[PDB]
Amino acid sequence: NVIIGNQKLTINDVARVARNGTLVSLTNNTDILQGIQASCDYINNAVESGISREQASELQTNLVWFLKTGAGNKLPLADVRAAMLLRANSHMRGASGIRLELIKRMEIFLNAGVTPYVYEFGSIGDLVPLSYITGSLIGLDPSFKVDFNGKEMDAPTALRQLNLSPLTLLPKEGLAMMNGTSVMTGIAANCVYDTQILTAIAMGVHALDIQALNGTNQSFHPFIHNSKPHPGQLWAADQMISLLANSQLVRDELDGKIQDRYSLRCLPQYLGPIVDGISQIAKQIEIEINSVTDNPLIDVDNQASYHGGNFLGQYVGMGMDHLRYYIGLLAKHLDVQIALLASPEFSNGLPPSLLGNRERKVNMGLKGLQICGNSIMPLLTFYGNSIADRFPTHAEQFNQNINSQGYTSATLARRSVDIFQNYVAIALMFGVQAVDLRTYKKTGHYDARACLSPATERLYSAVRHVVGQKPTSDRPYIWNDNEQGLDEHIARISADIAAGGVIVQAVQDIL
Amino acid sequence: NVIIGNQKLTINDVARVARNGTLVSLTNNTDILQGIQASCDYINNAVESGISREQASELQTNLVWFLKTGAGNKLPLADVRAAMLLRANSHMRGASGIRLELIKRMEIFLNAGVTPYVYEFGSIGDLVPLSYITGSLIGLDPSFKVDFNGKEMDAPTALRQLNLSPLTLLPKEGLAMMNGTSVMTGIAANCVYDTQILTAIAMGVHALDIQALNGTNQSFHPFIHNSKPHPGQLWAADQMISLLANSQLVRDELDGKIQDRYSLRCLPQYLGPIVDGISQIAKQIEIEINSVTDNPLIDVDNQASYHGGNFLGQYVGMGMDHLRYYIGLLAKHLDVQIALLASPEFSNGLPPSLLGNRERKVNMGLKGLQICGNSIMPLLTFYGNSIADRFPTHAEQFNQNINSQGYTSATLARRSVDIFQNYVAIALMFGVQAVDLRTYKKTGHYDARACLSPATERLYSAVRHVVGQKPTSDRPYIWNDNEQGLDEHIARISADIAAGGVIVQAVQDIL
Amino acid sequence: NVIIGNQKLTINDVARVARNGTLVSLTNNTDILQGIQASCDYINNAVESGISREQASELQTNLVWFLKTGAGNKLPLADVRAAMLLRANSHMRGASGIRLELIKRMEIFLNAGVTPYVYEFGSIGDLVPLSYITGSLIGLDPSFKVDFNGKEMDAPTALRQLNLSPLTLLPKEGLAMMNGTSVMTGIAANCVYDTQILTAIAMGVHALDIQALNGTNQSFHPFIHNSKPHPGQLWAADQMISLLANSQLVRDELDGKIQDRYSLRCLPQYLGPIVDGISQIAKQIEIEINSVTDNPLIDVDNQASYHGGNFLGQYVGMGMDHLRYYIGLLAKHLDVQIALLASPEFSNGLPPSLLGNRERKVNMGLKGLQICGNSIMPLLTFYGNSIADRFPTHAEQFNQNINSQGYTSATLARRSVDIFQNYVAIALMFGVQAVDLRTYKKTGHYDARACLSPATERLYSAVRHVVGQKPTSDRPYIWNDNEQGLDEHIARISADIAAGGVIVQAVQDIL
Amino acid sequence: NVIIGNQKLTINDVARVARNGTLVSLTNNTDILQGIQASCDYINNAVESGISREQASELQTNLVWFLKTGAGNKLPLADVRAAMLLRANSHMRGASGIRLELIKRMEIFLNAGVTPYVYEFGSIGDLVPLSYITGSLIGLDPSFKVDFNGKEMDAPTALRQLNLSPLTLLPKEGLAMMNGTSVMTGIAANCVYDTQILTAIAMGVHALDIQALNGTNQSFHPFIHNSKPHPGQLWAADQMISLLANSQLVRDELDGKIQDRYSLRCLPQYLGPIVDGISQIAKQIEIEINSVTDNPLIDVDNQASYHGGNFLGQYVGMGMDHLRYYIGLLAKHLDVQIALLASPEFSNGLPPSLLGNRERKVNMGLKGLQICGNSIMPLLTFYGNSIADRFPTHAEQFNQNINSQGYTSATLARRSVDIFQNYVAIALMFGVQAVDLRTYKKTGHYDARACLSPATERLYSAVRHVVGQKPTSDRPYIWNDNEQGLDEHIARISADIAAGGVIVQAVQDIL
């Protein structure tokens, strides 16, 4: 379903191909294929004129060899798939002078489920990581390993099973394959996709929190925000109105007639820059996704090639720095909401630590769960520190005196996202238990579905389905401490978010 | 020339009023004044109904008193003028319920040159800071000091000299004056203004650097950047083309026919996110400058008031974090250029440390100056750290469980900008000296004006004028070490940039 | 061999038990066992007086249940073994009121090779992590999983295979088991152990670097350092003298008769605070290893118990913050050395990027390897950021308004150490290749063993043995780019350091 | 009173000379003066043998000139006096080869009250800053300015008023004066002094807080800390016992018979690493103060000179990073105490925001003051970031590929200390007001002196003296909001702490 060459790829496109195994196909547009061939002819005819052919090919092949110096853990398969999709997407522009056959090799690997192994260390922002993909694609040596739908195999063996012949890199092809920002951008693309989703879910968590705390909806009145018209603020306030519409737990005051802490009253003002910043990043990453990043670039129309520096992924490096920074801020705001919920002094009447069965004097509720949340949030703000500014000025014989650190900035971002998925699962558990207890205080039973706004009811129910605890008027989500292993619930919720399950579908409208 | 009430204020408008003493006038538009009066009537009539009048006034007056708890150094006078301009601009929206007479008081202070003393510590993001301005405007007590065109005076005395009577705050007026983001935003506004100017100068510096290093202009060819179309990158590359147009020191290769380090070849790619980031910040600050930030907001059309949280300056807090982060990145890149210039191994033939008179074996050139630059740049990346994420969740009786730290973020940003003005001055000195030595190596004389692109020639000459060293074919900017105090030059250049002198006018087109 | 109860445990003791499976035994000292029993009698008799028995036991058991809220990846088995060793060590002090039978359970688990699974998230500095160990030790439920010499198994099943009966926690026993700093400290202990080793190896690397660069040994002359007598500096200078003693690659100038960059000439001064800081940390951690951290503490001699806060692991939190900070500094200094080695302009005659076979014009040497080092070092400085200062003041119903973040600080440190092992492997590879090329330039052959100081020869040869490349006069370590996968070498060296192989034994004297 | 040359200087010695104008005198010990002369003879006789004499002097003089490139604000006078004291102290070791007459010049300047102006920017860790001192001492040119007991004057004019003749630098004298860590260390010395004082006052603040909160003294019982024997923790616990001895506001429970938040119960555990860290830093700074840091070093006994790198101030750079980190931690802990005091939910019965006159329904108490405190603390943790790890590897023609950033680290530390003095003033105000209100709740009157422990009574009264508010049974420190400007009080207390007034004397025993 995803065609490469015609229209620009979106972050959503990359995600589907990387995470869902969506099939890919190179465009059949003759004009595109023509350009691709045309740039190759330029390099070929350049070799026929003006420093040889075989020597020029040996050089490209040796590039793969001295670059096989990766280290550390392997990148997740999804990120390597995203990188191949982007590398191919870049080539289709017809300015890299690479054979269509090599570009097709990536389509084949992506559709066949063959993913080259790539290391997390090696790039200052992606020669080294891309060399592992290159070497695997061409079947250079058995030392190059790949994952073929499940188990480890050497590149040559996969190429045999695919009934494909090894390839020999022609002049420029090595650089066309290994010079560029495809890997760091692929990682970043998936990070942004996941963060947009977690932000939507976080909005749903805040909507649950507001209801459990009996907060007012007056803070989201359009008059307030239109007077301070920041797009992200306007958006956040309007989304909360929709998330709280028809709720029986919020005190309705849109008519005009402080008790609410700032974490509720200033929610739109706080989230505004975060939402806008994530949107800015998404936009910048989408441009990077569709950029030609190798070097030199071939300009056929003028029969010339130019030496530039499009291989510097500064937008990804700084973009991911901001992304991690935004995530920390989202987590801290969510953690403060949990603090209000867990403390009798500020929860407006809820049981201490959202205890369920008051009868059992031994129960402590979600006290342990808050502590876990309190342990993860600071780590997220820790990851919100930057790395683009810490670039080494003496890199590569002092030739790369500036570099983006985009690759590690992206891998750090993947770590932040993975941690944030666990944190949001915790925030979701607090919000779900809290509304059941508030519903009880209001109606005498524990079925929050009878009072929740229809929008938050969808999320509430999705969470209860995932953990396997069906809402009942007789009991809230968590009753006695010894009836469930909260770790199992965190793990199940997090797994569902990562897989785009019912929890994600439930907030599909906030995206 | 600057009218408040009709059109939205721009960053440029604020800078002119704050730094240049541009006169301000409230709009005469009857519809605007009507709105202002209307919100006052709402509050008055609200006091006539439904908790008293005198008691309600005493409360507002006492607000000024318990808020007189500032500490630290005083804010620069320009930032306070900016704060008043914004506070008044906010009131003209007619949703604050403040008397036109109180708003007019700020107009009078601005035009009369009366600036209340305000402290750097006190706001978590601006009750405390604004309370000093409020107390001064109304002449509450002699304890409130102000600057009246030069010397310290107590507020009451200033009001007497202005032939104005002290004022008594009516219900809501205290909150309308002290609730809001006017001070942090005013500070941020001036910061963005100065940074836009410094960024333009930095571009001019890189242009001098490229020429002195005999770099190629090929890296800026439109084909390269149109294939990686990030707006900031495209802009950076195009601006450099213009800055380098008609230069005799650059090797012209726009025709298509690596030696250049990444700091030159990847300049557009690196500056792209920075330029775009500064633009994003500017847009967000301009919205903040024109927003109503007090509380509660008065909606006359519906005869109602709403309690919201527009006083949270999250966009300023995170925006200034980003701004300091961008400044650090700009400085580190500029430092890497200086390193190429000063080292024979990488300067492509320039004298070590840009020494002038080789005859005097004792001369060491700009070795000391480089060290000074090397000491300032790391400090700027240090200030590039963030503070928004470090907000105290236990603030104000746990009521302000989220705050923006916007005030200190803006003050930290003012420190970064002030330091960066000194740093850019140093970079300007290295660029000027370097082009004279390159010109000599190319023509046998030291008059760079005969080889520089016209665009950089304006900057080059503006600098030479400021330091008071006239370019001559016989001698370069710096000849013997004992002939000038480089500290004086850094100081003069820095002062001219801060004052918007000839150096700034010289790059007026890059803005 | 490691007995618990008599003498204080050392970091070396913890490492052996955690990593080498060294057997442990509780002391037979009757006085110690008496104290243990005595504190239990205090609690028992306290239950017999003055709030019940069964209710008091249910409370302790329920503690294990609501604390089963861990999340994220599992901790390495070694850290869990260290945690158990420390918990038991703490109990032997006789101030916890826990049955010898429960303390013995940990001895059995350690000796049997049974390691409870513990999550990386859950502690703010170790209730949650310790609850997993507790629940596994007592066989509370099948939900508690452990590793029994290789494969997963539930606690109950493990206890059955060990012929042990499940246990029921008596009053105070739950708190005695789960209240404390054992896990964070066990993690910290292994980190310190590994960092001391990496520091010794780094010294060896610098020794190889100095020789390859033909640096002088004059910088290490005792007169210089005795005039600036910082203990770590004095130590570093003296160790380098020993490491360089009898080298034929260093220019001998201890007789008194600038060319050397600061990374060589200021090595002792730079390493001094790092070596001293690491020593300070080790000392603090050893005290924490032997401290009683549960609460309340039982003081039998005075028949009383005190409520205190020994469970706050501030020394571990801040200690690990410093540790990561020191590691970053070690890596950065090492990276600058590599930069000198790889660049002809600064290597004092070595081939560019330490290329081996100049004949093959395609060879690029260790250019890729340097890029990899350049990508890892900045990440290490990134991890050198702190987390103790980012503690959440609203933690656990606002009861834990201060906490150490010791647990995550320790896990972050484990990440730093793991990353630094890969980095040092790269630094080792650069040093070994470099001395072969210097030996060649000096003698016409590549057997560095003929010119290296005996001390560095040991390290040199250990590295060559591990990668499987025997030194020969005919060829250096790296000849042609296509003859090896440098990634395999990085991995082998790193594995050897982590296992305490020949590379570690080779620097056994620098420890 | 302070003699240089015989015994090692202590931080206290430096502070007295720098801040109190204590007179200095060079030692008369003939052996010391002999060593000083001996090293000069070595250099002289070295010039008589084996470069040119005059040429060697011109070189040293030129050094002063190309190094006159400082920028930014001037250093405080006290820091410059400290720098001169340390420089002279270094020369007395007799290994520098500098004339006694030049060392005497610094003695004269210190005793005459002549302080050379020195800039904050210029050193990467102190050539540039030291060049300003040098040039002023020798009266090189009118461009060098100094402060002579009050007003600006040029160096030559000062030398004339002192009846001293300008001096000419002989070989090595330029390097002996400008190579070194004297300025950064002098700055650091004063920072450590002030921080030791602030830490002692903070302990007193915690003591007032504990009493006002009716906390228990059980948490400090020796049995608890002797079981977790970290020297700093043991020290903190014991000091608090002394600070709380005989208090009638604390609940006495040293007999053995949780309510207290961690900030009270875990105070010793938290402060321990801070106290120990500050002690470690002090010890390292005292060694640096007595070290010879110029180069090359002259070894007369062996008639030789050695080129080393003692001028790298790594201990100061990393030491000041830690110092700022510790300050941030101290402030955050103190802020959490203020939060407990201000909130009725946690203050154990104190009025909200420590309001005084409940009768006036308009009074809000110290609400504004808490906000100011909340704005300062986060800034201190921001400054707790490090700078040593951010050193530029391309510094000074790539010769200084490692540097300590010790100078800016020290200046940043001076900023932290200055800010912390304001913060502690605020903390003191909260503690004083708080104990008056607790005393009232306990006895019916507001004279805390009747219930406070004698140790805290001293501090309490010192503060009340400073602000000019005499304790009375009829009224507490703060009664009505409009009766005082809290900013004046903050300013007065801060000023007294900085001057070492009664507030400092009050805690002289905790130092």
Residues across chain C: 511
Reduced 3-state DSSP string for A393-438: CCHHHHCCCCCCCHHHHHHHHHHHHHHHHHHHHHHHHHHHHHHHHH
C502 CB neighbour count, 10 Å cutoff: 17
C161's CB contacts (< 8 A; 6+ apart) are C148, C153
Provide, as residue numbers in chain C, all residues whose Cβ is less than 8 Å from the Cβ of D228.
287-288, 291-293, 310
Q: Is A164 helix (H, G, I), strand (E, B) or coil?
A: coil
Is D400's Cβ below 8 Å from some Cβ in C?
yes
Tokens found for residue B289: 């400058």
Contact call for residues D406 and D320 (beta carbons, < 8 A): yes
- Pairwise CA distance, residues D260 & D279, whole Å: 29
Q: Is B121 helix (H, G, I), strand (E, B) or coil?
A: strand
- Of the partner residues D345, D346, D392, the one whose CB lies closest to the CB of residue A393: D392
- Pairwise CA distance, residues A222 & A225, whole Å: 5
Please report which helix (H) or strand (E) contains residue B24, including its range: strand B24-26
Q: Which chains touch A (3 or more CB pairs under 8 A)?
A: B, C, D
Provide, as residue numbers in chain C, all residues whose Cβ is less than 8 Å from the Cβ of A404.
none
Binary contact (C390, B394; C-beta < 8 A): no
Q: What is the DSSP letter of D251?
A: B
CATH number at residue A437: 1.20.200.10
- Pairwise CA distance, residues A198 & A323, whole Å: 12
Tokens found for residue A444: 């005498």
Cβ-count burial of D485 within 10 angstroms (0-12 exposed, 13-18 middle, 19+ buried)?
middle
B22 and B55, same domain (yes or no): yes
Q: Is A161 helix (H, G, I), strand (E, B) or coil?
A: helix
Please report which helix (H) or strand (E) contains residue B196, including its range: helix B182-212
- Pairwise CA distance, residues A380 & C405, whole Å: 12
CA dist list (Å): C103 to B227, B407, C26, C189:
68, 54, 9, 21
CA dist list (Å): D14 to A256, C467, D83, D95, D502:
65, 55, 9, 22, 21
A195 and A93, same domain (yes or no): no
Query: In B110-160, where do the E strands start and end?
Result: 114-116, 119-121, 145-148, 151-154
Phi first, then psi: what are they for C56, rounded to 5°? -70, -30
Q: How far is CA B162 from the centre of its chain?
A: 31
Residues across chain D: 511
Query: In B267-409, where do the E strands start and end?
Result: 297-299, 304-306
Q: What is the DSSP letter of A449?
A: G
Binary contact (B395, D370; C-beta < 8 A): yes
**Where does chain B break, by residue before each gap (C–N > 2.5 Å)?**
50, 125, 257
Comparing C-alpha atoms, which of C418, C421, C487, C497 is closest to residue C459? C497
Comparing C-alpha atoms, which of A133, A136, A131 is closest to residue A153? A136
Given phi > 0 = left and psi -120 to 50 = alpha, else beta, which region is C255? alpha
Comparing C-alpha atoms, which of A501, A336, A296, A312 is closest to residue A399? A312
Is D411's Cβ below 8 Å from some Cβ in C?
no
- Pairwise CA distance, residues A282 & A232, whole Å: 14
B256 CB-side CA count, 13 A: 12
- Calculate how close chain D gets to B149, using CA atoms only, in Å: 24
Contact call for residues A120 and A163 (beta carbons, < 8 A): no
Comparing C-alpha atoms, which of A237, A316, A233 is closest to residue A276? A233
Tokens found for residue B24: 């301000």
Contact call for residues B36 and B91 (beta carbons, < 8 A): yes
Is B20's Cβ below 8 Å from some Cβ in C?
no
CA dist list (Å): D260 to A351, A392, D256:
21, 48, 15
- Pairwise CA distance, residues C148 & C112, whole Å: 8
Give bridge partners of residue D147 from the DSSP assignment: D115, D152
- Pairwise CA distance, residues D87 & D83, whole Å: 6
Contact call for residues A371 and C124 (beta carbons, < 8 A): yes
B296: cis peptide before it, omega within 30°? yes
Is B370's Cβ below 8 Å from some Cβ in A?
no
Give the torsion sign (CA, D420, D424, D427, D429): negative
Tokens found for residue D457: 């009574």
- Calculate how close chain B gets to C267, using CA atoms only, in Å: 20
Q: How far is CA B357 from the centre of its chain?
A: 39
C376 CB neighbour count, 10 Å cutoff: 23
Q: Is B48 helix (H, G, I), strand (E, B) or coil?
A: helix
Reduced 3-state DSSP string for D386-455: CCHHHCCCCCCCCCCCCCCCHHHHHHHHHHHHHHHHHHHHHHHHHHHHHHHHHHHHHHCCCCHHHCCCHH
Tokens found for residue C406: 């010791």
Binary contact (A394, D394; C-beta < 8 A): yes
D153 and D40, same domain (yes or no): yes
Contact call for residues B12 and B193 (beta carbons, < 8 A): yes
Of the residues C382, C419, C492, the best mutation for testing chain A's interface (the one with the most A CB atoms within 10 Å of its CB) is C382
Q: Which residue has the tokens 């104005």?
A: B164
What is the edge-to-edge ordering of all strands in the sheet holding C145-148? C114-116, C145-148, C151-154
- Calculate how close chain C gets to A48, using CA atoms only, in Å: 20
Tokens found for residue D226: 């002797």
Is A468's Cβ below 8 Å from some Cβ in D?
no
Domain boundary (C181, C210, C245) is at C181
- Pairwise CA distance, residues C421 & C115, whole Å: 25
Contact call for residues C352 and C343 (beta carbons, < 8 A): yes
Tokens found for residue B74: 């005083």
- Pairwise CA distance, residues D9 & D4, whole Å: 8
Contact call for residues B456 and B436 (beta carbons, < 8 A): no
CATH number at residue A68: 1.10.275.10
Contact call for residues B272 and A315 (beta carbons, < 8 A): yes
Contact call for residues C373 and C427 (beta carbons, < 8 A): yes
- Pairwise CA distance, residues B49 & C160, whole Å: 79
D235 and D99, same domain (yes or no): no
Binary contact (D310, C228; C-beta < 8 A): yes
Is A391's Cβ below 8 Å from some Cβ in B?
yes
Domain boundary (A164, A181, A198) is at A181
Q: Is D297 helix (H, G, I), strand (E, B) or coil?
A: strand
Reduced 3-state DSSP string for C328-384: HHHHHHHHHHHHHHHCCCCCCCCCHHHCCCCCCCCCCCCHHHHHHHHHHHHHHHHHC
Q: Which residue has the tokens 């996709």?
A: A193
List all residues of chain A from 192 to 251 with a beta carbon under 8 Å from chain C.
none
- Pairwise CA distance, residues B412 & B328, whole Å: 13
Residues across chain A: 511
- Pairwise CA distance, residues A480 & A362, whole Å: 9
Is C397's Cβ below 8 Å from some Cβ in D?
no
- Pairwise CA distance, residues B84 & B113, whole Å: 12
- Pairwise CA distance, residues C239 & B57, whole Å: 76
Q: Is B448 helix (H, G, I), strand (E, B) or coil?
A: helix
- Pairwise CA distance, residues D511 & D500, whole Å: 13
Contact call for residues C194 and C421 (beta carbons, < 8 A): yes
Please report which helix (H) or strand (E) contains residue A145, including its range: strand A145-148
| Contacts within 8 Å (CB) and 24+ apart, B492-497 | B492/B466, B492/B467, B492/B468, B493/B425, B493/B428, B493/B429, B493/B463, B493/B466, B493/B467, B494/B421, B494/B422, B494/B424, B494/B425, B494/D71, B496/B462, B496/B466, B497/B197, B497/B198, B497/B201, B497/B421, B497/B424, B497/B425
Give the torsion sign (CA, A310, A312, A313, A314): negative
D317 CB neighbour count, 10 Å cutoff: 31
DSSP string, D9-32: P-HHHHHHHHHH---EEE---HHH
Start-to-end CA span in chain D (Å):
22
- Pairwise CA distance, residues C128 & C63, whole Å: 10
D46 CB neighbour count, 10 Å cutoff: 17
Reduced 3-state DSSP string for B382-412: HHCCCCHHHCCCCCCCCCCCCCCCHHHHHHH
- Pairwise CA distance, residues B344 & B360, whole Å: 18
C15 and C74, same domain (yes or no): yes
Domain boundary (D181, D207, D225) is at D181
Cβ-count burial of C320 within 10 angstroms (0-12 exposed, 13-18 middle, 19+ buried)?
buried
A84 lies in which domain range? 1-181
B80 CB-side CA count, 13 A: 26
Contact call for residues B428 and B463 (beta carbons, < 8 A): yes
CA dist list (Å): B5 to A235, B9, B85:
26, 9, 11
Binary contact (D375, B121; C-beta < 8 A): yes
Comparing C-alpha atoms, which of A414, A399, A16 is closest to residue A185? A414
Residue C211 known to bind ligand: no
Tokens found for residue C57: 């036991």
A3 and A94, same domain (yes or no): yes
B213 and B171, same domain (yes or no): no
Q: Which chains touch D (3 or more CB pairs under 8 A)?
A: A, B, C
B412 and B481, same domain (yes or no): yes
- Pairwise CA distance, residues A221 & B306, whole Å: 8
Tokens found for residue A412: 């750090």
Q: What is the resolution of this structure in A?
A: 1.9
- Pairwise CA distance, residues A180 & A297, whole Å: 12
The number of C-beta contacts closer than 8 angstroms across A and C is 242
- Pairwise CA distance, residues D270 & A308, whole Å: 54
- Pairwise CA distance, residues D427 & D374, whole Å: 11
3-state helix, strand, coil in chain A (%, to 5): 60, 5, 35
Give bridge partners of residue D2 from the DSSP assignment: D24
Start-to-end CA span in chain C (Å):
22
B402 CB-side CA count, 13 A: 30
Q: Which residue has the tokens 């420089």?
A: D87
- Pairwise CA distance, residues A500 & B135, whole Å: 56
- Pairwise CA distance, residues D120 & B419, whole Å: 11
Q: Which amino acid is at C444?
A: G
Binary contact (D227, C386; C-beta < 8 A): no
The number of folded domains in chain D is: 2
A187 and A262, same domain (yes or no): yes
Contact call for residues A176 and A131 (beta carbons, < 8 A): no
- Of the partner residues D122, D374, D387, the one whose CB lies closest to the CB of residue B382: D387
Residue A163 known to bind ligand: no
Tokens found for residue D165: 């003749």
Comparing C-alpha atoms, which of C380, C373, C377 is closest to residue C323? C380
Tokens found for residue C478: 């790296």
A217 and A157, same domain (yes or no): no
Provide, as residue numbers in chain C, all residues whose Cβ is less than 8 Å from the Cβ of D304.
255-257
Provide, as residue numbers in chain C, all residues whose Cβ is less than 8 Å from the Cβ of B384.
none
D151 and D260, same domain (yes or no): no
DSSP string, B214-270: T-BSGGG-HHHHHTS--HHHHHHHHHHHHHHTT-SSSB--TT----S-HHHHTHHHH
C121 and C239, same domain (yes or no): no
